[PDB]
Amino acid sequence: VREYSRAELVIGTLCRVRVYSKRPAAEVHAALEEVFTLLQQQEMVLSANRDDSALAALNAQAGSAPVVVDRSLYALLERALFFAEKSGGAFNPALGAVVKLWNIGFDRAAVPDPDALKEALTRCDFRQVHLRAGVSVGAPHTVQLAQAGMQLDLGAIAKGFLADKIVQLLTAHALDSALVDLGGNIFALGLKYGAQRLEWNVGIRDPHGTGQKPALVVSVRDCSVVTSGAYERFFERDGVRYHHIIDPVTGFPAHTDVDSVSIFAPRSTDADALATACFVLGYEKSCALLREFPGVDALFIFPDKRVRASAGIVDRVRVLDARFVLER
Numbered sequence: 098v099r100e101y102s103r104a105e106l107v108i109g110t111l112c113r114v115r116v117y118s119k120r121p122a123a124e125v126h127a128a129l130e131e132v133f134t135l136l137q138q139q140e141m142v143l144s145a146n147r148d149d150s151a152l153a154a155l156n157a158q159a160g161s162a163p164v165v166v167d168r169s170l171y172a173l174l175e176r177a178l179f180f181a182e183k184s185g186g187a188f189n190p191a192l193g194a195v196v197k198l199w200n201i202g203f204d205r206a207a208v209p210d211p212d213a214l215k216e217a218l219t220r221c222d223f224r225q226v227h228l229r230a231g232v233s234v235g236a237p238h239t240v241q242l243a244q245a246g247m248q249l250d251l252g253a254i255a256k257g258f259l260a261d262k263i264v265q266l267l268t269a270h271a272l273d274s275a276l277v278d279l280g281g282n283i284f285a286l287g288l289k290y291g292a293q294r295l296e297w298n299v300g301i302r303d304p305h306g307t308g309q310k311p312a313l314v315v316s317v318r319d320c321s322v323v324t325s326g327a328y329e330r331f332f333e334r335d336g337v338r339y340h341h342i343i344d345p346v347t348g349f350p351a352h353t354d355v356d357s358v359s360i361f362a363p364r365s366t367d368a369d370a371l372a373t374a375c376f377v378l379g380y381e382k383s384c385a386l387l388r389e390f391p392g393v394d395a396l397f398i399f400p401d402k403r404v405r406a407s408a409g410i411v412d413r414v415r416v417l418d419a420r421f422v423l424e425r
């Protein structure tokens with residue numbers, strides 16, 4: 098058994114993959130080469146903040162004719178629209194008109210204009226994203242953005258999608274033990290080694306920490322762990338903090354009763370979308386939504402440092418920072 102890792106700056110963040118394998122090292126190296134090539138290629142497909150991505154091209158055709166996309170992107174959009182509908186739009190993959198207004202706020206610390214923001218909100222109806230795919234052999238997959246000026250932003254689901262694609266790639270290379278970490282979006286594949294095989298111990302950060310040390314760790318196998326939070330990306334102006342997760346009803350950063358939500362799911366795509374929806378919805382409505390998805394678990398960290406975890410994971414949680422308390 099040998100342990101490997103590799104990390105690079107790609108898709109706007111640090112992406113790291115750790116593998117344990119008994120295969121020849123040259124086979125592991127080849128798999129990791131392909132992981133990082135995939136991440137480069139997919140940055141060019143999915144990115145909402147590059148002018149030259151496939152998504153940018155799709156957005157440039159809003160209000161016009163349907164656009165041919167590859168089956169991968171079509172599938173991701175289908176899943177995004179599914180979580181949009183299930184979450185009552187709390188997760189909304191067509192929020193680009195609003196996100197881009199706040200985004201420039203980040204760069205130069207300024208809050209969007211009232212009427213400008215109001216206008217942007219009229220161009221975020223995800224029910225106007227029409228996906229069509231014929232049923233005959235080799236029929237193309239198309240996307241049409243019906244509403245003029247609407248803009249897709251898949252920031253709340255793309256890391257999950259890519260983590261799932263990487264797991265599929267690792268498995269294709271006959272690997273079965275890995276920790277995939279895309280800017281904190283984790284997939285724990287199989288079991289690690291201590292030969293003693295053990296669950297991966299996935300850390301969850303103090304929402305207000307310097308990010309160094311985890312506050313809690315959860316032991317998992319074959320599971321994604323994806324966290325959304327109110328302090329991973331924000332700017333401040335005149336004593337007010339404006340974070341990156343938007344409430345689509347208000348067009349402002351969500352005012353919510355949790356500091357972070359972590360979703361545990363067999364598919365990272367699903368964990369990523371649900372984490373964002375749940376953050377926007379807040380605790381009680383999240384619990385209601387999650388009743389719909391029995392195969393997922395959740396861990397909520399509240400502003401008062403209480404932690405609540407669903408029945409499927411609560412016994413797997415260990416508190417490392419004693420300021421936090423796990424309710425049982």
Ligand SMILES: Nc1ncnc2c1ncn2[C@@H]1O[C@H](COP(=O)(O)O)[C@@H](O)[C@H]1O
Nearest residue numbers: 187188189190252253325341342343373
């Ligand atoms: N309510 C929302 N639904 C979907 N995407 C959002 C929403 N608010 C912001 N976004 C975009 O998705 C990112 C949040 O994803 P996450 O960190 O996974 O919660 C933001 O940085 C925006 O790019």
Ligand SMILES: [Mg+2]
Nearest residue numbers: 253369370373
């Ligand atoms: Mg998300």
Ligand SMILES: [Mg+2]
Nearest residue numbers: 253254256369
């Ligand atoms: Mg995310």
